Each structure stands twice: as structure tokens, then as C-alpha cells.
Amino acid sequence: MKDPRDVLKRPVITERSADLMTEKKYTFEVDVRANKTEVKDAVESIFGVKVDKVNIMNYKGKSKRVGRYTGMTSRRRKAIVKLTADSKEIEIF
Amino acid sequence: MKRTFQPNNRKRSKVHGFRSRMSSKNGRLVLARRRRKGRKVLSA
Amino acid sequence: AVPFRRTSKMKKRLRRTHFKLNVPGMTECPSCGEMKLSHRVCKACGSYNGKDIN
Amino acid sequence: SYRKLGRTSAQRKAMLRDLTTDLIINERIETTETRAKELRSVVEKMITLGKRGDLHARRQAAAYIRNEVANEENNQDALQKLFSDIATRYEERQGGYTRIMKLGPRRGDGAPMAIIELV
Amino acid sequence: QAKAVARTVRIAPRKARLVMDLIRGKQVGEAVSILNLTPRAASPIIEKVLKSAIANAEHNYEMDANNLVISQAFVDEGPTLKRFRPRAMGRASQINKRTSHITIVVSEK
RNA sequence: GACCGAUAGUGAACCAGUACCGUGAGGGAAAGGUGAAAAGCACCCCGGAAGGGGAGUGAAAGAGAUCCUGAAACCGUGUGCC
């Protein structure tokens, strides 16, 4: 239980994400109940690279007004990993 | 010119909260009354 | 300081007789006359005493 | 008499000073009709002081003409422009260096507008 | 004998009748000059609808614009928006934002 | 069912114990109908757009989006007699 592919959900592709990716940093969306250590091990196992540091952050939901109804979107958790200088680059397509 | 309402989350939860209302039998009566009517917001 | 009775329609219509506005005082220009105001420079071709300033 | 233009005695003076300094630089303005009618007198008085051309004159005008650059690439102060160009331009006329030309009203508040320029 | 309507343009009808009284009955060419030399607020709207009526007469019926005169020039009233404004001591008086329908008919003399 | 038919019948025929009001226990609404079928107005003209005038669909367009019928108070345009 706690397979590593359950921690990572999907990559993040913006201008900021590519700017960071220029410097061997990669941005992911992870499960809302996973701490930095499982993120580190999961990245190590899935891709086979060397990890140096991990930084994590929490996001709240947003209010939307489609039609005459109102609601809220779901929370998010974002992680930024930094590979070492010798490690290969992860082929994020 | 102070008005009568001054917001505070800690006092609100300590006085009108769910965990506070579930202590006496009268609070449980209040919760049952609210459930019977069908209110969306039980306690505060 | 408060009206004693409501006002009918005849009195209202009678009072509104002088609440109106008049036609402007206007005349055309010698060159490309565009029916401008008197003693004023027109904005397209009512060229006041020469060129059309604006 | 004169008109108060809806301002206090100390803002009226400042507004007249600003207008008479801008007219010298730009050679033609557009303001309301009442402002132009109250401005032409002061601007004509200033021109004559310049035409005299002395040190007292220069100093009197200096205590009214705002100090803004009037010509680039020439470091020409507005006072220098007044005492150099206009005096030679109107060296033969005896009064009446201005003319007012009316236009239509304004959209925002219906005020009547006019253009005042140097002739 | 073409016409044109405006149908719920935001302006109080009492203030538009003041100009539509001026314009009624005249000849089409003279009409526009009076309309665009008047300083009120309803003049641009009335001028636009009059131009539309003239264009309708030109294209759909081949009637020519050197003869047209204005025959019917009335103004009606439309639905109302109700707002509020708070007064002293918790009173909240009431405010009305009116609307109007504008109609013009052009005919060959 | 010699019961109601949208101010009636449940507070609620509609995203109702909702929206709003109150620190709280608590109080508590308004709001139904295009057409048999979207066949829901290609194209042209005026306009920045909104909105119109044609042309078309339809048995009906005064049926065109709070779109069955549509009264009264209220607001206007023309005219016969004073």
C-alpha cells in the first residue's frame, strides 16, 4: 500500500514552470496528504534520478459563478523538486 | 462609538460550537430540534 | 408644509405650459454651408471668415 | 469691475498666471469664453512691458511670468522668448494683439468654449 | 412611408418629449441641423433613429430623400428599474430609473 | 372523492426550510404556460453595440425568448363641438 505512483498526479505547465525547468527544477501536483519524504522517494523510484531538495505548498479553492448557481473548486498541493548537477534530466514531454 | 458586535472566532466556537452544545442535555435537545426542521447549518 | 389635497390633471397640464425650449439661432456658411450657429466657427465646413477652424 | 470665476482670491491669481504663461509658449489656447475674456487684458499688459525692454521691466515681468522652458535645443526661458521674439514681431502695432473665436458647447457640462490666439 | 423604433433606451420619457416636440412636423433636411445644434442629451439618440428611418425609406422603397417630411414623432414609456438609497436613521427611500420607446415615421410629401 | 386549481392547495407545483434577518435559541419569503415540430429569423440595409426596416420558416412573427388570453388605475399622438 502506498504505491509510489499514487503520490504524483500530473505535471504543471506554465511560463513560470518552464522558466524554472530551465534550471533543473520541476513542478508537480501531489496528493494532499503526502509529506516531502514520500515525494522525494517517489521521484527517485519512478524516474531514476538524484534529488537534492524538495519544497511544498498548499492552495485553497476558488469561487465560481456558472449560471445562477455558486460553488467552489477543490484544494491543491504543489511540489518543486531540484535534481543534482550530475543527475540526468527527467523527460517531461 | 463602539457597536455591540465585535468579531472573534475563538469565543464564537467556545460558546456556540457543536462540541460545546453536545455537553448538556439541553444542547442535545437543541440539535435534535434543528435536525427535525431540516436546517442546513447545525450549530456554529 | 405638506400638500392639503392631491393635484388634478387639468392644473398639472396648465402649469406645464411654459416648460419648453426654443429653436437655436442658426444660419448657413458662405463656403460649404452647414447651417452653423450665428457668430460661431463651425466644426466641419462652416469656415468662419476664412478657413474652417475645426 | 472684474469676475471672480468661482475661485478664492489666491487661486484666481495662480490660474491667471498659468494661463498667461501657457499662451506665450503655445501661441494659441482653448478655454471657456469667460476665462479668455478675463485673460486677454493681462496678456496684453504683459506684452507692452516686454516691448519697453529694460531692466526694471524685465524684473517686473519676471515677478509674474512662470519659469518653464519655452524652446528645446535652445535653453530658452519663456521670459527670454517674450523679450526676444514677440517684441520684434509686433513692433509696429498699437494695441490689440489677441482675438477670440467662439465654438460650440461642451458635452460634459454644456459650457461654451472659445479659442484665443496671438495676432 | 417607413418608420424606425428604439425600444427600451435608458432615458426618462419626460425629458425626451421636450426635444421631440421641437422636431415634429419639419422637413427632413432641416431636421438634422436642429437636432445636432441642440445641447440636450436625447438629441444623439433621436438623430440616430431619424437617420435609420431615412435609410429605410431609401433602400426598401426607393423613395428619395429630397422630399421627406416628419409625420409622426411620439415617445412612449417602458419598464422601470427600482433601486434604494439609505436616508438618515435607517429609512431607505426609493429611486426609479425610467426608460422609453422612441418612434419616428417619415412620409413622402 | 356533489375536495383545491398558482393571493387557492403543504411554509414550499420552480435547485425551499433555500434567499434574507438575528451573537444565539429563533423567524421566514417571492417566483407556472413560445410552437404539433426549433422549423429559434441564411442573406441585404442603418447603427460602435443595443435596437430596428426588408427578405425568409410557420396555420398564425400583432408567436421572436418572463414568447397563451390579455381588463383597470396611469402615460401619450390625431381630430368634430365649445
Place this chain on the structure above:
RNA sequence: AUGAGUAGCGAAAGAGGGGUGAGAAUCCCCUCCACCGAAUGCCUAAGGUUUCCUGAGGAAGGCUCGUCCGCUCAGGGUUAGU
């Protein structure tokens, strides 16, 4: 509906030249002028909850106008062994 196109529009200095635009007293840029300075400066509580950044908008809200906005629609943005 009447009162009625009546009362009000909530402490304060702006002027000109450009610009953009269907449209500018009210929006952007420039230059002069004016106001606070034991604050009308900065940092940050409680409380608020996306109001923050960029690109479009001109139905409703701004006590006027509006090409503008703490308004409407789309995308983004918050990194700790001390």
C-alpha cells in the same frame, strides 16, 4: 399616481499640451502649481477572504460621465532544520 423636473448629489486646488477612441471637464503620458509630514509616511495585529498579477469588456453597480475601477469574463500567483 400627487408633491415635481422640486430638495439633494456626503469637509479638500488645479491649468495647459499631447494621446487613444464611434464618442473624453472626468482615462494614459509630460510640464508647471497646490496639500500632509508624533502623519494623509512604513510594518503588522484582530477581522476580511482572492479583493493581488496579466489580457479582454462596456448589459447592471460607481449619487454625473466614462475608452476607467476594489465591477464582469478568462488565465496565472503564496517555496523555511534557524
